[PDB]
Amino acid sequence: SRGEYVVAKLDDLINWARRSSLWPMTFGLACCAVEMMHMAAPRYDMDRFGVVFRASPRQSDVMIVAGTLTNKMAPALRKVYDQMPEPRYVVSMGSCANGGGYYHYSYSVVRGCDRIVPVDIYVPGCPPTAEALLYGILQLQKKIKREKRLRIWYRR
Amino acid sequence: PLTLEGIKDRVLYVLKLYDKIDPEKLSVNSHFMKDLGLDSLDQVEIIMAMEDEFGFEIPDIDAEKLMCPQEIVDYIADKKDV
Amino acid sequence: MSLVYMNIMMAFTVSLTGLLMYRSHLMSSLLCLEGMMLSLFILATLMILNSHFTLASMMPIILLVFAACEAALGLSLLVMVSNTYGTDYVQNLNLLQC
Amino acid sequence: MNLMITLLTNFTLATLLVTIAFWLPQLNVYSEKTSPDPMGSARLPFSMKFFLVAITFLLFDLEIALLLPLPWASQTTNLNTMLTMALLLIFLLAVSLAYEWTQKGLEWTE
Amino acid sequence: TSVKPIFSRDMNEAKRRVRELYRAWYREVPNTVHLFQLDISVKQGRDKVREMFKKNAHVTDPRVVDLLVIKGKMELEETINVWKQRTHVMRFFHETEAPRPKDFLSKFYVGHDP
């Protein structure tokens, strides 16, 4: 029709603007923060993708849980997640944030950050290389690209 | 705090505000443990209600010796002029 | 007399009535006092520019500077009051009844 | 006249951008969110040093207000008096600064 | 049979420390309900403090109740000084947990455990 075409082009516009301007709030929990720092370092360089370095949590677009989520800090994780404006996204980086990892059977470790926050991209590795974290960021951008917000709005 | 009568009426009003004490059996010389059926923690929150009402601190080695409202009003009379 | 001068005098008397009926705060008193100073600046300026009286054009600036320094003094007094009571309430300033 | 039109156009563009910045994402039906920082329920303690630097700004700003007609006062015929009073005002600003120095007024925000 | 004490020489000073700890928790429940903006009442929090004191009431050892008063003062210090969050205070109120079956027959119906 006509309105289907209009909402499809405006979906393309807002999806382009959101995926090409992702601002991350990186939780520097553990060793995966070092490899996020290498993903911001000149060789891999997140900033040329529109992915800025260390955005503040009250304007950031994607939360990167990089490291081990323990039981003492899981309420702080959910608090910073609740303080993020929508559309917020969660990238889980590394094995301890994915499922508990090397500390899975520990008394003090949250077995996966997806027990706390809704997680969009699971980045595997211990740590995943910065190239692989960048692969997860680009896969998140392709997930944002195929969103259908105004199409489902026009169809509901 | 002026007369013993105002202090006695205010002691009985505090102990009838408290829900677990039955106000029918509540008298002036009623014992807390064997008569009113109160735990020791009940007696201690009674003493803290007395501190909230009368406006001063009651120590520990003399709140253990407050087992009836008569000794409470006699203690407040001893710690005031009346 | 004239019209716009009557308006600036009306503003001066309105900020005077606000300066003579205290509600809660000392900062409200200082604000009404400086609204009075503002209206004095405006009315002096319109008179001095109206008559083309040249040497008095430095007068409103003088009328500003001193009185702004005066306001600074008032602010410092408020601060010392707010360092004793925690608020700038005028009802905390009643110890001199006796 | 042109100045008032320009101020009105700048104010209209400012209010229009603020109104677009508030009403355009409120088209979204995103989520009504709940559960409301370095203090949780602490009051504000006053700091004397911030008030001292504010009043120091105000007093030196008054001294600057006196110093402002100097590019016009350079054109006068009594240049000896004008030079003496210009140097006297800047010297009194410097004496106010030295008194702010030596009485520890410029400390912990020096 | 002769041991070194911690703070109390007998159960008199031990019950004194228990009693003053209960006094401090009773004074701290309304502030805890206020500043943590909890969804409980003050009477409900005092019922929980009563339950936490009557849970350990059967202890006849003065050193054990000395350490229980010490750990209660640590819980009190984490509550007064705002070190606990809202979650750490609501963990005493087992709200998301379903109530466990207490009789024999429903425990028989649901599983293998006594």
Ligand code: SF4
């Ligand atoms: S997944 Fe492994 S390497 Fe990565 S932060 Fe965790 S412990 Fe460190």
